[PDB]
């Protein structure tokens, strides 16, 4: 008759990194870094907006002839752009407050374009048809932004302009206009007659006077003079006013809308599907028990916190083999595949039979302490977390987390190594002379010990009746 002690073994192939060793295989472990990949995205159903395609945000909101006219979905929480977006502002210039506008249009609940100033009626004292250019071609001919009108002098005069609109739609309206900056004084006169011109766009929430500059910029897109693009939001009841004597690209179509909070922009070439999945990577599970991912530094919506690591996996079980104290990788040089009940257990051998059995007092106390320690790590992560603080904390927190996982993995395997050494010392202190030590984690029972006698050693109550 013989009694032996050993560890649990299983067919798991999970590898963890420790302080001393790396790529160590273990029986049980929890991951700390998830990388599935975008199916498509495809998130919250329709929800991607009017896939921008060959245009960008500026060209879409201004109405570049190359972009597809509405169309345009009624609602979207986020916007997708392509890196190959060649078509933006056809006429050269720069879009003023572009980053702000991008974040405003990101998430929207209701969106409607309406003709704020009809071309035919609103402009009786100015020529609106001549507002075309070679920089904005449509079908091999001069065209212009579908949402704007480039007012030119009507013959030999450009009268003072004064147009206004009252927001009666019951929701904030996005208005966009442009200010032209010609090349030479001859072009300035040929477009708006007057020489010293001015533009003023007033409202309750916005007010600014533009004095256009007439200068020869280096040639771009076959236009020497450039054009800056401006915008504002008119609250319901507020009245926008356009006072100008030239060099003003008045609006044609405004956008009545109801914004939503948060969101951002995605610049990628991936295509679209419909699958009702939230921000967390496909298939919308999402369903990511881990608070870490390695996909993109910034992601849109209620997602986990990004960490650029090769792998993070916290260890829970012991080394899988189908030490410091001397147990694991020591006297006991192998694990038990047959034993499945618990991490630590015994193995009896007598005339009645043979079988494996786990010590639940040591196993349950370990599970309670391990689970408590695993939850303490997820707590220390979530509870405590411009380029030197946004990007600086990321690289240092990643290294701080890597160090902590490495540190906590070594403390885990040593805690198992100690629990087993304590289980052997528990048996050794009971039978001093009744059985000798084999050296392979086993004991040679000199006297007879049946199934009921073997249970007395498991119970922790051993008697000394015989040689």
């Amino acid at each position, epitope marked *: 008759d013989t009694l032996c002690i050993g560890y649990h073994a299983n067919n798991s192939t999970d590898t963890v990194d420790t302080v001393l060793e790396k790529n160590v295989t273990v029986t049980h472990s*929890v991951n700390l870094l998830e990388d599935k990949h975008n199916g498509k995205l495809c998130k919250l159903r329709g929800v991607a907006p009017l896939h921008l395609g060959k245009c960008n945000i500026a060209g879409w909101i201004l109405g570049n002839p190359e972009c597809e006219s509405l169309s345009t979905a009624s609602s979207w929480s986020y916007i997708v752009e392509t890196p190959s977006s060649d078509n933006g502002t056809c006429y050269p210039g720069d879009f003023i407050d572009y980053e702000e506008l991008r974040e405003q249009l990101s998430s929207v609940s209701s969106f409607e374009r309406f003709e704020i100033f009809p071309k035919t009626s609103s402009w009786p004292n100015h020529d609106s048809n001549k507002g075309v250019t070679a920089a904005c071609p449509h079908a091999g001919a001069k065209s212009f932004y579908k949402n704007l009108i480039w007012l030119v002098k009507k013959g030999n005069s450009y009268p003072k302009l004064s147009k206004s609109y009252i927001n009666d739609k019951g929701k904030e309206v996005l208005v966009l206009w442009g200010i032209h900056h010609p090349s030479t004084s001859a072009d300035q006169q040929s477009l708006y007659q007057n020489a010293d011109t001015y533009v003023f766009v007033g409202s309750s929430r916005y007010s600014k006077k533009f004095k256009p500059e007439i200068a020869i910029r280096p040639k771009v897109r076959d236009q020497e003079g450039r054009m800056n693009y401006y915008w504002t939001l008119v609250e319901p009841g507020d009245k926008i006013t356009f006072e100008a004597t030239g060099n003003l690209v008045v609006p044609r179509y405004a956008f009545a809308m109801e914004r939503n909070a948060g969101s951002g922009i995605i610049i990628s070439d991936t295509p679209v599907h419909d699958c009702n999945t939230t921000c967390q990577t496909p298939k919308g599970a999402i369903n990511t*028990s881990l608070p870490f991912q390695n996909i993109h530094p910034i992601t849109i919506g209620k997602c986990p916190k990004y960490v650029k690591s090769t792998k993070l996996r916290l260890a829970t*079980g012991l080394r899988n083999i189908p030490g410091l104290f001397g147990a694991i990788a020591g006297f006991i040089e192998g694990g038990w595949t047959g034993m499945v009940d*618990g991490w630590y257990g015994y193995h009896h051998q007598n005339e009645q039979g043979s079988g494996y059995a786990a010590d639940l007092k040591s196993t349950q106390n370990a599970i309670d302490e391990i*689970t408590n320690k695993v939850n303490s790590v997820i707590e220390k992560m979530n509870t405590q977390f411009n380029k030197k603080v946004d990007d600086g904390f990321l690289d240092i927190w990643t290294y701080n987390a890597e160090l902590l996982v490495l540190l906590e993995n070594e403390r885990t395997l040593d805690y198992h190594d100690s629990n087993v050494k304590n289980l052997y010392e528990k048996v050794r202190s009971q039978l001093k002379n009744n059985a000798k030590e084999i050296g392979n984690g086993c004991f040679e029972f000199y006297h007879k010990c049946d199934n009921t006698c073997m249970e007395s050693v498991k119970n922790g109550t051993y008697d000394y009746p015989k040689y």
Partner: antibody
Amino acid sequence: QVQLVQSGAEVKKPGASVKVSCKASGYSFSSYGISWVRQAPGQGLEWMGWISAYNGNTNYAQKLQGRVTMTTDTSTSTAYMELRSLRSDDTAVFYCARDRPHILTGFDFDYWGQGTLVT
Amino acid sequence: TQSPVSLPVTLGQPASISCRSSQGLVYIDGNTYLNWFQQRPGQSPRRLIYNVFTRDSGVPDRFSGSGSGTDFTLKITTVEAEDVGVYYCMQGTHWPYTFGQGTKVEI
């Protein structure tokens, strides 16, 4: 067709003990893994105990640890339940369902019992 | 801790329940939260979404349980008339399993 069956409703006065059985029947039965839960009207649910014929050492609820007791049979494939003292607030419907034979591998109530209503 | 104890809803529109715990239970290999069952009047409860997100066999796709860390929810798109009864949260990791007050659904 895979479902378990248990004893019918019973009734006992305050003081006398009571016993309830839970047979496994057809079909796909783990050799091991059985739990018990109670539900009184007006309250909610609370765990009573657990047992495995592997035999992993059973587990009881500290509050009811003194009184409850668990037993099982492999041949008949049936689990039994026992209580000592009874009282007015002790009335509840006792349910029985399967659990992980391993216990450390996981937990799942794939199939539930009928509900032994004891007063 | 469950909330709310009384949940009044109507047909067509969805619903949601909330459960929170004392510790961010996980276990080994992400067992996390036990799944949720629906107990109809005078009937035993049936399994729904085991392992937090994995749905149960023989259950429509209308139900959907989601959550991460010690609060959780269970959403059901379009409420039918049969979706009535008492609902409870499921103890995890611990053997002192501890269930909810549960929420009584009514249409």
